[model samples]
Target: LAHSKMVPIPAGVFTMGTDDPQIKQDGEAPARRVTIDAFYMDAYEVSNTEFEKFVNSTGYLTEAEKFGDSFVFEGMLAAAPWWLPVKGANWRHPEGPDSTILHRPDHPVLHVSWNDAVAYCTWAGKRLPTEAEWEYSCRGGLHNRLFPWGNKLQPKGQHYANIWQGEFPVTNTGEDGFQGTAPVDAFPPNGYGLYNIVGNAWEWTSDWWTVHHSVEETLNPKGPPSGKDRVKKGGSYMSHRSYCYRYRCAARSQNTPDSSASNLGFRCAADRLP
Candidate 1:
């Protein structure tokens, strides 16, 4: 199994989902009971260096490469002919063929899908973190922390993670140390010693999509048995509170299993004997 610095999360009950009334999206609100077994999670989101190791070892080409194109930002479409979908927008070229990760090697690899993440996990003898496990580890032990660090977005006037700092999808002042995605560990680690758990790139989880957040929590919920879209958690640096504020712990989004975007990526986990 894939091994790393593992934090032991004893079996315990923690408030799962959102408790807010105004922000209840009926799919992730009304926080409820949830429990998860101990497991090891990546301290940092998968990076270019780490993912490259998997690709090189397995000679695997990501779906993005095989598809010949993946989704680009609506803004990048205006600046370039990105609406047609750009080939070579895989993990190696998040911004397409013209860009490089040389300046941002530490950033999380984006433009990946659930299948791609699954492939990497399988090759490494790991698996995608379950929704329950993901939420628990993301909390880093805090009961109801608005963020990994605390309730304050910028505690004592300091940026914690990379999120939309200025206007959404427009004039990003880059106040949080990046115009696009920042280094995976650009900010401080969460309580669990995990980095970029909040904002960097949206992570693919092992859950299937179901529009039933109002149904309350279930034990080790694996989501629907089958669905068109898979669950994606966290938010990206481009996530803005004004619009797509789904970056919060209880928040979520979904896309087709084959979908890929420059803002999407994933991390892996190893299950333990319960």
Candidate 2:
């Protein structure tokens, strides 16, 4: 059962967002302290093998498949634009019709939209983590830390997650032993026993894109009632130090609910039954 693989996150308060001028984004300004209730979260991002089971069982057509296309990084296509809308680029064929997850069953599933993730969660009797829950769990009992592994990007000079290690949109050093998505359990688990929480792929959260935190909504907070885009956290394989350094625990970004990309995927979350 899927529940067998989930880890329980204890209830607690954590200070979210970074105040470092070098790493802070406009939306991440003014770190706020917030409280979160106990919950259950998946230990790893949904793998291609698991997602395939969902597809085989339900015969569900993902948004990308229905639309006949999805967004891919330009570097993967001819290195022209940063983002390209490619045909036949769904979860099955990550790049296009030429690509396949043939030997990558353990790798995290990509080219999945927020809607696609929701569909999977529904089928599995679960749901996406709220933005607050996502961040709180990501902190793993740490307070205002830059990464799930503490302040150092690479403590003791060991690669902790799968992220771009060279000039992005052009060259990849493969320093973390991968040029793309690594196996879901490729890295060490955080304090809460969650693996690859900051990289590998961005996970969908059940919250809309909000600019910053509000003091009044500190306890069990949810995002705004409406938004054009849903929140995505933990960055992805495409994240780089010089480009998108959003691999940090407090970092966040957003995309439309229908949007799917090669670097986007999600895990399931469940509330503790009282």
Candidate 3:
């Protein structure tokens, strides 16, 4: 069950934003209390094997494959220009026409757009986690903190997630043992047994992007009714503290519904049935 391993998240109310070192315009401030219901979350991000089986079983084509291209990190491309859409950069070939997933079966399937993730989740009898559920599960059971593990990155000088090490867009020391996306199960699990919830790759949520959260105490909150972009949580292997500083528990990012990239991926969640 490469894609079926799920952890149970208990129901509770917890702080949802950060006050210290807030991300300014990203609207990660005014830490608020949000009550999230219990749900089952994938223990790991969707892996290549899981996605491959879905495609082969359903005879479905990903949006990237149909569009003929997706974004790949310039660092992974062995070049340096931020990043550009490379032709044929679909799930099967993450880098471009030359790359292949043959060597990386356990890696998280990259180049999946929000729509693509939803399609896969549907096939698996799961769904994308709501923004609230994502963050609540991410915190595991901890109070306000920078990461799922805790405030200290590499607590005790040990790396818990895959992220850019030395620098960004240039020299990645590879100290995290990955210059790009690592296997979905690469890191240790959190307090709730959820893996890679803060890094490795960004995960698409069911909510759309909103500048600021509207209410203080809410139940099972979702984003606004409509938006130009969708919410993606967790940072990525490309996330660095100096610049793309999102790797926090409350960190967030966004992309167009159809946008796909090497560092972007997703997990699945399910409702608890009585």
How does model 2 fare in lDDT?
A: 0.86
Order the candidates by lDDT, highest first: 3, 2, 1
TM-score of each: 0.90, 0.94, 0.96
Q: Name the candidate that leads on lDDT.
A: 3
Q: Write the per-residue lDDT of candidate 3 for residues 1-274, one digit (tens) a residue.
A: 4555988899999998877646788888778889888789999999999998899999989898899888887767822367788999988998998999999988898999999999999898999999889999999899988889888998999999998888677798888788777888888899999888988889999999987775478998887899999999999988888888888879887899998998899999999521
The RMSD of every model to the true structure, in order and in angstroms, is 3.3, 2.3, 2.1
Q: Could you give me the TM-score of model 2 versus the true structure?
A: 0.94
The 10-residue segment with the lowest total lDDT in model 3:
73-82
Which lDDT tens digits does candidate 1 get at residues 1-274? 2223345555667887766732455377667888676677877788777788899999988889889777777555322343346777777877688878787777788888788999987887788998778878888889976777778888999988888877766677888888778766668878788888888899899988876654455677676788788888888888778977866777787889998898888888887532
TM-score of model 3 vs. true structure: 0.96
